[PDB]
């Protein structure tokens, strides 16, 4: 069950953003959204794909364990913040593409396909090249599917060891406060064009007191200056709901 | 750890606040520690609520705490602090130092298992005299700052005699600050104000995972006035800021 909450639309129109926010208290039993149609529309995951990629890297032994360091070979990478040795949390937080590309290459097509099927991850379409299907290939996932996937992770119900799920959950912590912990991951496909915009994402969950809230936000984006809206719109909505 | 050296230059942060205390800071890659006071770093004090760390691990390892999603339900009975009068997750109980929750865990673990684990953990003087639910609060248990960091390193490395999963659970429950470049895991403790001639002790212990480095730390101080309690965080935070670790 997905229900439309029209009052959240204020945060989108105030910014002239085409987008969707999906929020589920306690479980995916019932979610609320500003837009029923867009809630189940599928988009390129971009770096939100780091979450399944890291789980699969762990499960297959490509990532040795929680303390694995991804060493920089000294060669140019697309962002300076990637040009350094990284832990799994570090590679996740800076969204270090070449680290996840090398994980994906060693996982290989057969195992990658198998795990995306086990995780019911979007259209499970990995065509477009092993080290770029989530960046520019055919893989698509909706905000609803993201929250379903995050809930499984939270409950250790994905087809992976409990240890590996716990490892990725810790690597995903982005805000710690006395009353709550936020686990989250951003994504940004690029700007495309005005007529064919990129997509930006922010997905995760908030463990607040004894409750949990799963969330997934996405928006069309054609200008990088608008990127902070992927956190501020959902954060404003979660603020007015009393969650954070 | 591999070595320890005395650095008297952090003393400024203590003298500025008229605090008698000790900071111990260890860099995991070099296995080298620094401290303002070698003598105090080896001195053993009541752990107070820093004991929640081993107590949580032991509670999980024995099955007393079912899993990381265990909710500790409030019975409706008055507690010493309003904070504690609510259902709590494991992180919640840790972050508010909910004594009665930890008391019930220890009672359920029991003396024999608690002794066994504290021995396996090499936890302080391993003395659980004082009653199963208060030895770490007003009993005979004592631990030094050096022992705290050694214990925390073994936790970080999953080297304690507990499942990897349970250590993982406790490590995330201890998260107190998250930034893009670092994650702080920590726990406070506070024994009481004692008297002027016999002050209580306040602690702050934990570790910072910073880039690919890890820094283990343990702070304690004499305390005879609750108003001084925030210094247990501000002194070591100021030290770690000036070291370029956090901030």
UniProtKB/Swiss-Prot annotation, chain B:
Cysteine disulfide partners in this protein: 26-33
GO molecular function, one term: penicillin binding
Top-rank taxon: Bacteria
Organism: Pseudomonas aeruginosa
Annotated consequence of substituting residue 139 to D: Increases resistance to ceftazidime about 15-fold in P.aeruginosa strains PA01 and PA14. Increases resistance to ceftazidime about 30-fold in P.aeruginosa strains PA01 and PA14
Activity regulation, free text: Activated, with respect to most beta-lactam substrates, in the presence of 0.05 M sodium bicarbonate.
Reactions catalysed, as given in the entry: a beta-lactam + H2O = a substituted beta-amino acid
Keyword GTP-binding: no
The keyword Hydrolase is assigned to this record: yes
pH dependence: Optimum pH is between 6 and 7.
Function (record text): Class D beta-lactamase which confers resistance to the beta-lactam antibiotics, including penicillin, carbenicillin and oxacillin, and also some cephalosporins. Confers weak resistance to some carbapenems, in E.coli strain C600Z1. Acts via hydrolysis of the beta-lactam ring. Has penicillin- and cephalosporin-hydrolyzing activities.
Oligomer and partners: Dimer.
EC number, as in UniProt: 3.5.2.6
GO biological-process terms attached to the record: antibiotic catabolic process; cell wall organization; response to antibiotic
Protein name per Swiss-Prot or TrEMBL: Beta-lactamase OXA-10
Record GO cellular component, one term: periplasmic space
InterPro entries in alphabetical order: Bact_Transpept/Beta-Lactamase, Beta-lactam/transpept-like, Beta-lactam_class-D_AS, PCN-bd_Tpept
Active site: 49
List of residues that carry N6-carboxylysine: 52
Gene name in the database record: OXA-10
């Amino acid at each position: 069950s997905i229900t439309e909450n029209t009052s959240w639309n204020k945060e989108f129109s105030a910014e002239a953003v085409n987008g969707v926010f999906v929020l589920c208290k306690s479980s995916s039993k019932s979610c609320a959204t500003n837009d029923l149609a867009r809630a189940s529309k599928e988009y390129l995951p971009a770096s939100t794909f780091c979450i399944p990629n890291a789980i699969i890297g762990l499960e297959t032994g490509v990532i040795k364990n929680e303390h694995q360091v991804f060493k920089w070979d000294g060669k140019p990478r697309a962002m300076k913040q990637w040009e350094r040795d990284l832990t799994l949390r570090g590679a996740i937080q800076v969204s270090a593409v070449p680290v996840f590309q090398q994980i994906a290459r060693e996982v290989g097509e057969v195992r990658m396909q198998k795990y995306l099927k086990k995780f019911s991850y979007g259209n499970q379409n990995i065509s477009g090249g092993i080290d770029k299907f989530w960046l520019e290939g055919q893989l698509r996932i909706s905000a609803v599917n993201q929250v379903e996937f995050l809930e499984s992770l939270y409950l250790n119900k994905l087809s992976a060891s409990k240890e590996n799920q716990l490892i990725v959950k810790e690597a995903l912590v982005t805000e710690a406060a006395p009353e709550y912990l936020v686990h989250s991951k951003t994504g940004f496909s690029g700007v495309g064009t005005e007529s064919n915009p990129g997509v930006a994402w922010w997905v995760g969950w908030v463990e607040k007191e004894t409750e949990v809230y799963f969330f997934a936000f996405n928006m069309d984006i054609d200008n990088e200056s608008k990127l902070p809206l992927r956190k501020s719109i959902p954060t404003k909505i979660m603020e007015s709901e009393g969650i954070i």
